[PDB]
Design a protein around this ligand. Sequence first.
Ligand SMILES: *[C@@H]1O[C@H](CO)[C@@H](O[C@@H]2O[C@H](CO)[C@@H](O)[C@H](O)[C@H]2NC(C)=O)[C@H](O)[C@H]1NC(C)=O
Ligand SMILES: N[C@@H](CCC(=O)O)C(=O)O
Ligand SMILES: N[C@@H](CCC(=O)O)C(=O)O
Lengths: 50, 331, 78, 51, 27
Amino acid sequence: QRGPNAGGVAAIVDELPYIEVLLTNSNCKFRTVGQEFTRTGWGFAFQRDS
Amino acid sequence: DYVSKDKNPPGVRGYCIDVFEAAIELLPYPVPRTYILYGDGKRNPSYDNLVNEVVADNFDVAVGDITIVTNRTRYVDFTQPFIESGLVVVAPVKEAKSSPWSFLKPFTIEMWAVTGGFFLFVGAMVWILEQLITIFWFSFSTMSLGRFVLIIWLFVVLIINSSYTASLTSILTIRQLTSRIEGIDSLVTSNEPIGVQDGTFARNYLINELNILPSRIVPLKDEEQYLSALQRGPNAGGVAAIVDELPYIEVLLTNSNCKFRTVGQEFTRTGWGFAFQRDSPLAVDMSTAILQLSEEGELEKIHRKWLNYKHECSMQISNSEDSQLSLKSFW
Amino acid sequence: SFLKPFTIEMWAVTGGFFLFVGAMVWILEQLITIFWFSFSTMSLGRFVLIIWLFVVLIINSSYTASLTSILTIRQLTS
Amino acid sequence: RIEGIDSLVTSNEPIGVQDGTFARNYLINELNILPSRIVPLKDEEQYLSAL
Amino acid sequence: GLFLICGITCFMALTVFFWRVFWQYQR
Ligand SMILES: *[C@@H]1O[C@H](CO)[C@@H](O[C@@H]2O[C@H](CO)[C@@H](O)[C@H](O)[C@H]2NC(C)=O)[C@H](O)[C@H]1NC(C)=O
Ligand SMILES: N[C@@H](CCC(=O)O)C(=O)O
Ligand SMILES: N[C@@H](CCC(=O)O)C(=O)O
């Protein structure tokens, strides 16, 4: 809301299924300006060779 | 140039081999070793079937151009990335012409003689109502029945004004809205055939992640057909763009003329590496070798031996496609 | 960004040679320059008035066909 | 715009179909349409709210 | 087609001028 000035940031880099939660909560005053510039996916993290 | 068949008594030649060789004499270990080639001499070998021959323990180590993907890190262990790489998009450059021919272009060459011809024959109609004697009509045609000739001739010039605009717009838009790509997101949606190299992860990364049809991705064998699939363009069986790793592309620009340029940035920036047997203790041995090989600058000195080919040749450098009315159009 | 058609190397050529063909009115003419604005608005010097009418007739078209080439693709650059 | 099925193949917009049909597995199998574009739809009230 | 109107209008005024020449001979 403060934009680049007044101590604010210009653009938040987030993962995709957080932006989906954020943009539904707000109105469409924010846009996902590009696409997924590193698309990997989530997952569980077991111990090595288990 | 990177790794190759050779007739020498080591058996192979390239760049990654001599990075692998120059890490061995940093280790305190006298390591006996052999070199077994893998694929045919007709195309590239499938690197998912090279790393598959390390999981099944036919090879203790795959040295080459093996690129770190998140299945390949899962089944084998890699070293540190000794060189950086990313998938780029190479494509033909913008050849925006400039001429006084480009000035007179929105009419046919016959139309520039009919229009200039039917200003003098209409100008000769003024003499019926009416070198130095012929200029007297121009003093009379600055602004009865001869006024009715001027009314129809007005609506002629109010059409040749109003069509020369409509054929200089319809050139200056279709020149902009032609089949263009300026990023990977331009290449996903514009449904043109994409070239890749054969035997890579780039075939099964665009399908798996970028959601590209398998009929668009066209394999390609060698570096001469990496030109003939772009000289023909998207039509005539060729492809629109080749998607390769960055150290392959910086060879292709120097090997060809200044007709291609990487239209985007790297959209997956991972790096290369040696593919070991899984959980082998040599991986902690050669990760310490390469990170000592890099900080002593020897990793750069070997790069000048084989990969010295680097010419910028700034044909276009992220050029803004905008107004840009040609300098030779008003020459 | 209004001035963005006709990139800035081709404005001073336009207004500069506006005066060069405008100098031809003064040839075929404070008190001389005020009368130099007379025939510049609307013989051998009257034949350049035909050709200079054609030149600004294309600069009117090229400035429109540059501005239509901006206001259309900027509706189609997503 | 779309004025034909060839307009709808290339213009990469999401296409609605009805659920449980051969039209889902005819556009994929023959017309070469991505499976992510074809969106199933249950009943005749949602055949309006998807347009 | 637009040059057809260049032909019909100009050839119309030849006939009005020739009728004026035919009336020039009437003096
Ligand atoms: C992920 O990488 C692996 C190795 O390339 C592939 O998964 C299986 O790997 C085993 C090796 O032990 C093969 O025998 C299987 O045939 C592979 N599975 C399949 C379905 O081929 C797999 O190819 C990679 N994942 C993707 C999506 O390509
Ligand atoms: N970096 C590519 C190279 C493929 C090739 O050279 O054919 C890979 O690892 O898949
Ligand atoms: N004619 C369609 C009907 C499908 C439906 O009603 O769901 C079919 O046979 O597949």
